[PDB]
Design a protein around this nucleic acid. Structure first.
Length: 73
RNA sequence: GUGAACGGUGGAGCAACACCUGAAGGAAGGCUUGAUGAGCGUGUUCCCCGCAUACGCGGGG
């Protein structure tokens, strides 16, 4: 749907030393949702790639999600 | 599976010691509780105001 997400927050955020990717956050939330359904005894790595994001494919393997790292205003 | 996940700013420490709000300074100069209101003259039909509506009532000097 080619969309943009803005997040505003109450307390100031712990500033990320490296890039805070949107796909990382959505994968962690999908892992938390998978812990909600199938309990805590899961592999997190089977579900954080099941995301509502498209995947860009590099020419030699090595796909990435179509999300971007968060920009701070 | 948020370069994530985990992580106590902590422990102790006297605002305290001494210090006169005090010296001087007139509530006075003048002022009847004494009265005031307590008793002492006119001798008979004359104007004017209202209610009436004139049969009379009240009333000014």
């Amino acid at each position: 749907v080619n969309l943009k997400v803005t997040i505003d927050l109450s307390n100031p955020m712990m500033e990320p030393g490296d890039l805070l990717h949107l796909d990382a956050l959505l994968g962690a939330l999908r892992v938390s949702r998978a812990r909600a359904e199938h309990g805590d005894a899961i592999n997190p790595r089977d579900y954080h790639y099941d995301l509502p994001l498209e995947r860009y494919q590099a020419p030699s393997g090595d796909w990435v999600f179509k999300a971007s790292a968060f920009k701070l205003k």
